[PDB]
Design a protein around this ligand. Structure first.
Ligand SMILES: Nc1ncnc2c1ncn2[C@@H]1O[C@H](COS(=O)(=O)NC(=O)CCCCCCCCCCOc2ccccc2)[C@@H](O)[C@H]1O
Length: 607
């Protein structure tokens, strides 16, 4: 669609009308393929053509229109499979607000599911026949008046579709679905306009052509897995997916989906968080004597949702370069739920941009390049260029003032893809989404946005440098000790490089007040460094601790006051698998981390 400063639609912005059209001209073509690895090690493909997809969406939608009213929320408590997509699109087809969640009988934070439900109060629950009893059982733990009707989407017959009524065309405020992140849970209001805008933004950035195909193992309950699933079939080829557990168990599965197949006229496109690249590199290489592996066909594998490590990038290429994997296929990318999904990515024709900058300058808020062999060198991966019809600026948050390039400040963003608020929360909505950019530089990274445009504060620090956006970390994760700043991922890299006994990527650095440290001055409240590190899957703690302490002291000039070593799987991670530093700190302070009793729901390599 055309651009006039912003993205214009009419013919419509409804994904419903667009899928229905796309469906009538490619009826027999495949739309989705689910690789089910639950009973068979090599997988069993479950296919869905466009005509079947449409038929099911219309049937589920008609059923929803009989038992829910316009404006009601419809929660999806379903495992990762074809039915999850049918349930989600069914909600959109019905003109009801979907709430993509997960199957309560699978791993999950049960207290958060209760909190989410306490905020969105759905009028219906969409699940499958297999998951239904488990869903009901969960609702028997909720109050008697909060047990909405449970619909098994695979049991709604196709003929129920005859009564389906295409909902009223959406305006710019009409909410399509709520995206819960990540306690207290905030549901981002994603409008049909938001969704269609980000879809167009992503398609422009990916430069997908006839024959390219998309694939993913990412969970549908997270923005990166959901949005990818909704838009991948739109590039012209069916979308293939598997579960996260399936990937974690045998990462080679992802690698072989990416690889060239007979019949491929284009390349493959996927997306994953940074830790997944390391898991694939260490455990996803074919064993000698396996069928040939040709990865020279990969077009783009986006690396986003968490900090990109230059070492992870190097390890991925070292493992898969010998199989033809082109290094320019790795595309560091940035985004967040409040922006639907996509904010920036490395241009299609370019290789990842990775620079080595001065540590001290970085810690004091400035990007200054240095030689890679310098002892003060910190490697920073770029997140590329901001997408079309959206803007990102770097600001001094308190004065809402843009900063010149090379200076670090909070990243604020704007665009038609920004969510319209958080469900039921006016104060939080204003604070996060309705910020005003009071002062701009010349040139301004806000050029093209109106002076009264609203800005979302991302909670991230970053900077522009030589035409690329760099994400340095979350504001709330910064380590401030004795008047100096330290990025926790830089301290973590030093800790793991100091000892082979630490699992790569499973380290968390944060500060706690002096008085919260263990017994090994009760009025001292100054922030002190703590390193939590998982042990590689037993060597005594003394030598390891001293290696960590000594390496951090020499290059960062800060003394670790406590090094806590845990078993693999002990550090808290979000539901999409990101190391959660604030959560690790809270577990350190509330007694659960030291007692070795932290609950994690994302599948772990060991268990
Ligand atoms: N690059 C980065 N570096 C450091 N931190 C990053 C980060 N990206 C996100 N984060 C951190 O994650 C936070 C947001 O978390 S979140 O709400 O859970 N949301 C997220 O994590 C969303 C991240 C989205 C990243 C952009 C990915 C766009 C993928 C399009 C692929 O399309 C396809 C794929 C296949 C076929 C066809 C098309 C952010 O606020 C930031 O703190």
């Amino acid at each position: 669609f055309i651009k006039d400063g912003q993205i214009k639609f009419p013919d419509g912005s409804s994904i419903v009308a667009h899928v229905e059209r796309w469906a009538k001209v490619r009826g027999d073509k495949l739309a989705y393929r689910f690789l089910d690895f639950s009973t068979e090690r090599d997988g069993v493909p479950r296919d869905l053509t466009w005509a079947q997809f449409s038929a099911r969406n219309r049937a589920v939608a008609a059923r929803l229109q009989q038992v829910t009213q316009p404006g009601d929320r419809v929660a999806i408590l379903c495992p990762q499979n074809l039915d999850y997509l049918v349930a989600f699109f069914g909600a959109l087809y019905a003109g009801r607000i979907a709430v993509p969640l997960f199957d309560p009988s699978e791993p999950g934070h049960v207290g958060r599911l209760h909190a989410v439900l306490d905020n969105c109060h759905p009028s219906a629950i969409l699940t499958t026949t297999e998951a239904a009893e488990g869903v009901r059982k969960f609702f028997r733990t909720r109050p008697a008046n909060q047990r909405p009707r449970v619909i098994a989407v695979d049991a709604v017959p196709d003929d129920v579709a005859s009564t389906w009524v295409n909902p009223d065309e959406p305006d710019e405020t009409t909410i399509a679905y709520l995206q819960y992140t990540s306690r207290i849970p905030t549901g981002v209001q994603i409008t049909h306009l938001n969704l269609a805008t980000n879809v167009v933004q992503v398609i422009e950035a990916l430069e997908g052509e006839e024959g390219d195909r998309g694939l993913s193992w990412l969970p549908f309950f997270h923005d990166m897995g959901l949005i990818t699933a909704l838009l991948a079939p739109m590039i012209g080829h069916y979308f293939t997916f598997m579960t996260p557990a399936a990937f974690v168990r045998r990462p080679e599965r992802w690698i072989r989906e990416l690889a060239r197949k007979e019949g491929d006229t284009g390349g493959t496109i996927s997306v994953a968080p940074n830790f997944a690249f390391d898991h694939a590199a260490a455990r996803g290489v074919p064993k000698p004597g396996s069928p040939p592996l040709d990865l020279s066909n990969v077009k783009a594998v986006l690396n986003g949702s968490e900090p990109i490590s230059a070492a992870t990038v190097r390890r991925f290429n070292e493992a898969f370069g010998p199989f033809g994997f082109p290094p320019k296929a790795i595309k560091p990318s940035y985004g967040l739920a409040e922006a639907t999904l996509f904010v920036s990515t490395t241009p299609s024709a370019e290789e990842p941009k990775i620079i080595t900058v001065d540590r001290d300058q970085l810690n004091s808020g400035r990007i200054v390049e240095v030689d890679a062999d310098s002892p003060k060198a910190v490697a920073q991966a770029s997140a590329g260029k901001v997408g079309i019809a959206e803007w990102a600026v770097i600001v001094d948050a308190e004065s809402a003032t843009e900063l010149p390039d090379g200076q670090v400040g909070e990243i604020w963003i704007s665009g038609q893809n920004m969510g319209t608020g958080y469900w039921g929360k006016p104060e939080e909505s204003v604070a996060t989404f309705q910020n005003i950019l009071k002062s701009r530089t010349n040139p301004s990274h806000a050029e093209g946005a109106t002076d009264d445009a609203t800005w979302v504060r991302t909670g991230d620090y970053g900077a522009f440098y030589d035409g690329d956006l760099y994400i340095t970390g979350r504001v709330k994760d910064l380590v401030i000790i004795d008047g100096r700043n330290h990025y926790p991922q830089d301290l973590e890299y030093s800790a793991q490089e100091a000892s082979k006994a630490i699992r790569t990527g499973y380290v968390a650095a944060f500060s706690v007040p002096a008085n919260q440290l263990p017994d090994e001055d009760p009025d001292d409240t100054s922030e002190q460094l703590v390193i939590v590190a998982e042990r590689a899957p037993k060597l005594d703690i003394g030598p390891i601790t001293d290696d960590i302490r000594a390496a951090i002291a020499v290059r960062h000039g800060v003394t670790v006051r406590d090094v806590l070593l845990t078993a693999a799987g002990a550090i808290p991670r979000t539901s999409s698998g990101k190391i959660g530093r604030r959560a690790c700190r809270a577990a350190y302070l509330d007694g659960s981390l030291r007692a070795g009793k932290v609950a994690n729901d994302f599948p772990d390599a060991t268990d």
